[PDB]
A paper describes a structure:
In two classes, the NTE is bound by a spiral of pore-1 and pore-2 loops in a manner similar to substrate-polypeptide binding by many [name]+ unfoldases. For example, density for the [name] NTE was present in both the [name] D1 and D2 rings in classes I and II, but only in the D1 ring of class III. In classes I and II, residues 2–15 of the [name] NTE were built into density in the D2 portion of the channel, but this NTE region was not visible in class III, presumably as a consequence of its conformational heterogeneity. The register of this [name] peptide is very similar in each structure, with the C-terminal portion of the NTE (Pro24–Pro25–Ser26) near the top of the [name] channel, and the N-terminal portion near the bottom of the channel in classes I and II. In classes II and III, the relative height of [name] subunits was A (highest) > B > C > D > E > F (lowest), whereas in class-I, subunit B was higher than subunit A, resulting in a shallower spiral when aligned to the bottom of the IGL loop and the two flanking [name] subunits. For example, the D2 GYVG pore-1 loops of all six [name] subunits contacted the [name] NTE in classes I and [name], albeit the D2 pore-1 loop of subunit A had a lower buried surface area (BSA) in class I than in [name]. For instance, ADP is bound to the class-[name] D2 nucleotide sites in subunits E and F, but the GYVG loops from these domains contact the NTE. The presence of 11 engaged pore-1 loops (five D1 and six D2) probably contributes to the high affinity of ClpAPS•N-degron complexes assembled in ATPγS13. For example, in class [name], the BSA values for the D1 KYR loops range from 63 to 196 Å2, the D1 pore-2 loops from 40 to 156 Å2 and the D2 GYVG pore-1 loops from 101 to 179 Å2. In contrast, the D2 pore-2 loops only weakly contact the NTE, as the BSA values of these interactions range from 20 to 74 Å2.
Author numbering:
A (entry chain E), I (entry chain F), J (entry chain D): 570 to 748
B (entry chain N), C (entry chain M): 2 to 191
D (entry chain L), E (entry chain K), F (entry chain J), G (entry chain I), H (entry chain H): 2 to 192
């Protein structure tokens, strides 16, 4: 709400915010970070019509109307992020697997994920509209759900030797368990 | 009175018309005699859909009995210029200009209903006045017929000789016969 | 004027036309002479309801005294390529296209009122001008007439020779006679 | 233009039309000449009220100079089909079709104002064409004419011959003369 | 176009049309030729006011050049039936079936403007057809003629014979002359 | 299409059309031929302003070419009935029953624009039928004419003889001539 | 159809019409044949803008082909009445009344596009009936003609004799030529 | 009916018609015969877009079959006056007036679809009356014809004599021929 | 209220709920479950159509609408309870009878329940919207209410040997009393 | 909130403000100053039309709507602040440079900037709508950022003697670290 934006105006310029009891919130040491998706819609979306106009400055113009000039003036800098590349997304899959691999390595269960499975998870896990947020969800349902069940009972409790794979006939992810 | 459908969105409930709600699903309807205002309305919807999603194919139904040829070109050129493949589902009567739009659809995406009736004929126009003036308009209408016949052959794929031959006289073609002529890919399976 | 109605939803109260509420329950209304304009509205209602929930069934009431063949045919084709069974009920009166659209519903779902009056006759049309154009135009309507009797015989199940003979001229079928004829079932008052 | 009215609901204030507000209280107005579009609207109102409260009885005020018989029949069938009793209070004037719907109301709930005037006649229809077409077309005119007599006798209770002779020509039945005939139970003056 | 007026209330501000704002204050406007459609709004308005407050009086400003006799009875029947006293004021002009509603108002709550004019005449109508049908239609005009004079006599208090002789032809009565006749109790110079 | 305007208030912003926004400041526009329907809006607007403030002065901009004389009297009666002084201004032309409402304003508040033109003439009406009916209707227009001259004489201050003399035929009184003839107090060029 | 336009107000988002947004910026549009109704709407826009900011200057785009003379005088009088200078711009074409309003703007604020056109012609009107009435009406048309020429001379600056001789027959003045005649101050090609 | 399109915003969804949504993207639509009313809407949109961003170019689609030349000047003059360059895209067909506005766009931004047509011919305006009045009006139409030819020469680049010859009689210019004549730089196929 | 849903979202993400007093609570070892009686109204809603036979059978869609999409992402899976069968209701009736029999043992009074009697109790005590909830009241009013009248005065004061039967024509329960 | 302005009425006219306990404050020796940016948006607003209109009057007309007449009547004077000119920015740059020299003086570093650098830096950060706050960012982005890397680790850790100059060919500043 605009009432909240007004509170932040004094925070940036003076570094202090008063409370109900009158205590001065001296927090000039805290770093302030804000996240917004206001201008992304204009960047990805092209201008309507047969001819496409220059939309380079259209993203910045949206921030000028949404945020008041005094608020934007107090900001030290605006950090414009860029969409993830094809190679960058592949590294994200390795990052999540490393957490699962190291989490299970101490338990004694080795994990060997095939390259085919990593590529499939990227497309399904990363949505352009919703970002890479579903990666944690699909990883949980695809990997944590089956392995967790066999962990308590079955051969997977000890020995590890887990090897994941993907079949081209159905595009599904196969599972491997050994003692 | 047009109905007022309701849409379930996380932000809240929104009220839309039946035609407007269908526009969200890339469904565009065409009916009635082709007019300048009617054609510009279809063109406006196409431009909006392109910006929303240039990949998702658009659907354009046709149930018009034909109209002015000049205004119809604005819809044809727009359909080719836009990146999305605009399918053409002929749900009823399709005259010469109405059929021209059906042929203008993307190859492999055009369709027609089994009981739909499509008739194509040479452009019909008239003019009166001084002898010199009628000659200019007479030459122009012949040029339009050539352009319509030339573009029709390109989309349908039939030889120009056959296109100009049958188009001279009034012709009525059914839905199954249309597949033989190459006018439409195939009827809806289900 | 269309009276408004309030719906007490979980979120809160919502106000919309009476036709909009019935549309929410998959209850489409067909009234008046069929034309290219109202046809799109009926088809638009079927397409929107199908996307919302194709498992459920749609309802359609017939209270039309006639209409254009091409215009009414658009509604017939819609009911075929959609999974929801389009129930057909005759309210007040039916006609050549009203009866065709009334008997086009899924077998068993079609119903009728006790005092309903049905009327069925062959398509009526005419063309004036050059003899050559009249030949193709006159020859074309005969094919449509045979097509109407063919599709009508499928849903009804009657022989093609019997249905065409009765449809050659004006034939009035009341509610009890319609059940014997095979056009519609009887409404379950219980 | 129809005026607007405010309803002081517990949740808050809500604006409604003069017809919409009355519709919320189970009240339908059969105003204007009978037609397919106007009759279809009445059918929609009856179905909506039935689902809201099937136990409660719907109220209808018949005020029209008559019209097409085919469209009016749709109201008759829907009225008996719905469980709620369709009360019929003739206001100002009731024509042949208007009176036909007036009798359709549930026994004991039909009413007529003191100065209301009822009128009943036979269906008026015409057809032009070859002699063979008039014969088959005219047959339906006699069937619907005779059919309406049986439906009128079911509610009115009068003999078929009595309705046939009276329906042959125009007959103006005033408010007291209508209760004696049996079309209505009594006038609505007090309760 | 109809202007929009603001109504200040403790809950907040509400916007209503010029006609709806006065309707909230129990003021109804009878303007134009009497008809079934315009009569339905007047009838619907009276019923709404009765439910809101059946004790307060209802005011009806009648500025009409005359119309359908059947539609007017619908308004007249409702005015008497409902418990509230339907006060009537003749603004600008009153004619056949427009003036009848003016006198129909409750006794002691009928008024006329200083420069208002009121006229009354017998019902005017016609029919074309066979002599047999004309007999029934003609009898209806006489039936309504006698009934209409009986009502005007009951409200005005004049002899039934006086009304028929005076209402045979157009009678133009000025605002002061109306009080002597009995159509209204007095002139609306002030409360 | 009437443009919409915003009214800045402490509580918030209210969107109102141009005509309704002016009504908020006691300004009523009387434009177009006088009729029973448009008259109700002027009468309803005057009553709404009286309730908001019964002491402030209402303003009426008359820019009409005239019309029904009896319908216009409903505005004049309301103008004198309500306690507020209904100031009158003449925009463009003023004709029969347009000028009568222009001169009906309170003394010292009636004004005219420098280029506004005023037209005054006797009522024009025609009726055809029986000789007895024509005589009855003839007396009405003659009686209304005398009342118009008497009422106009009071406001303007001229004798009934002189106003009657000018009203026999059309008389186009310019803005200076109108002030001279008592139609208005002065002009608005400098006030 | 009228396209909507969003205004980035300090309070928040606000939707306005294409004409409403321009009206907020003191930009009024005069189009179509002059009439009482449309002229009243233009007058309403001028009065509303006066109180909002009298120091500022109002702008008027005249694109009318000519119309009623009476309604046009109401606009001219209001322009001179209100303190703000009503700038006038001739878009496309200006007829006799359109040109009379164009030159009526304050000095130093009248402009015309380069390809715009103007036209001035004597008032046109006719009367039918009795000879005496035609004489009264005949003098009125001539009287109005002398009034426009007298007023046009003041704004333009040409002698009344020059205006009368030229205005006997319609004269079309282009944008450059119009400045020479004194109707407009300068061209609007650039400032 | 015009469909509604929703645009997602941070605070809440906004509903706008298809024509207004495209207007937000600097896309004007010129459809149908030219007129003083429709032209007023086109210039209003141009002025509104100029204030929003005086740098971004405007896009004016042209699918009109021709109209009055007077209203066309308002659009042509407005296009040149505003700083933003207007991109004219010929959709379907462009008549004499439409073609004039088409070529009136900034150099390098005028385009035509491959199947669109461009027709140009002299004005068809006609006048009737006395011989003296015809001479005055006849001389005016020649000036407009010469003025249009001169303006077309500047944009098209052809000599006045060449435009006179081509405009002497009706002529239809195909989309590729328009590039040869000099009305547009090239076809709209790539961007 | 909307603010209440956000309180659950915080614990589902961070797993720690702060207190104004300053106590630190951990939900790591606390299982969280919530029930919603939504969609039953939509199913039991009477159709506005003329036939009234329209059935929804899509109550799961309503569940997703009443809850925000954010809440759905946090929950891994939702549990759905299918409508009970008439045969299963018979077992629920026996549960209330057993408790009644145990209560009567302290006084030396027996209770016999016929197989036909259970059918009447099951239908009367089972509601589509409320399920087995009325069973407690239905069992009490039918069995316990009359029993007390006879137990207070009559043959049932001593001896017990209670018997229950129902007439087939009227379908009304009649309880025989033995001394 | 507009209702809060009523508290300052007695403060500006009566000179006292009573508290909850009845204690009367004294504002006779207090200087009251208020800051607002109401008329800013109206002035910068671009009018729609062929002839541009001066919107300077809209500055005061908006202030009158926000503050009632009784509130403005008590005010001693309403001072309207004007946009900073190019000449003023040159002096502002010297202020920020002096402030930067005080921060460096604590560490011991001495900064000397040429006049040419000041003019180029002023034009880069000259924003009329944003006043002089942008000048802080250009100084921060151009001068402080290269210095932070050296002050922590490098030649400028001890000794300073920083020289800033701009070469015309590159049109970018040059930094010389002399320890």
């Amino acid at each position: 709400h605009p009432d909240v934006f007004n509170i932040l105006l004094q925070v940036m310029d003076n570094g202090t915010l008063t409370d109900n009891n009158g205590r001065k919130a001296d927090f000039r040491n805290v770093v302030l970070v804000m996240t917004t998706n206001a201008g992304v819609r204009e960047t990805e979306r092209k201008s309507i019509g047969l001819i496409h106009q220059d939309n380079s400055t259209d993203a910045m113009e949206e921030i000028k109307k949404i945020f008041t000039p005094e608020f934007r003036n107090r900001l030290d800098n605006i950090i414009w992020f860029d969409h993830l590349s094809t190679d960058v997304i592949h590294q994200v899959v390795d990052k999540f697997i490393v957490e699962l691999q190291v989490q299970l390595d101490q338990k004694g269960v080795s994990l060997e994920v095939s390259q085919e499975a990593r590529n499939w998870l990227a497309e399904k896990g990363y949505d352009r509209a919703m970002g890479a947020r579903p990666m944690a969800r699909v990883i949980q349902d695809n990997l944590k759900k089956p392995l967790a069940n066999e962990l308590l009972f079955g051969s997977l409790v000890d020995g590890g030797q887990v090897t994941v794979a993907l079949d081209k006939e159905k595009n599904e992810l196969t599972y491997g368990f050994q003692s | 009175l047009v109905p007022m459908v309701i849409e379930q969105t996380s932000r809240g409930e929104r009220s839309f018309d039946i035609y407007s709600r269908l526009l969200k699903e890339r469904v565009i309807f065409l009916t009635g005699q082709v007019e300048d205002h009617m054609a510009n309305l279809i063109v406006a919807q196409m431009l909006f859909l392109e910006a929303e999603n240039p990949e998702k194919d658009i659907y354009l139904y046709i149930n018009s009995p034909g109209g002015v040829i000049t205004a119809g070109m604005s819809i044809y050129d727009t359909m080719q210029f836009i990146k999305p493949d605009v399918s053409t589902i002929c749900m009823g009567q399709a005259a010469s200009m109405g059929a021209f739009l059906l042929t203008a659809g993307a190859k492999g995406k055009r369709f027609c209903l089994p009981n739909s009736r499509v008739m194509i004929h040479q452009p019909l126009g008239g003019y009166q006045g001084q002898a010199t003036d009628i000659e200019i308009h007479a030459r122009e209408i012949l040029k339009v017929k050539g352009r319509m016949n030339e573009l029709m052959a390109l989309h349908t794929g039939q030889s120009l000789e056959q296109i100009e031959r049958d188009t001279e006289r009034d012709r009525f073609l059914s839905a199954p016969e249309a597949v033989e002529y190459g006018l439409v890919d195939s009827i809806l399976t289900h």
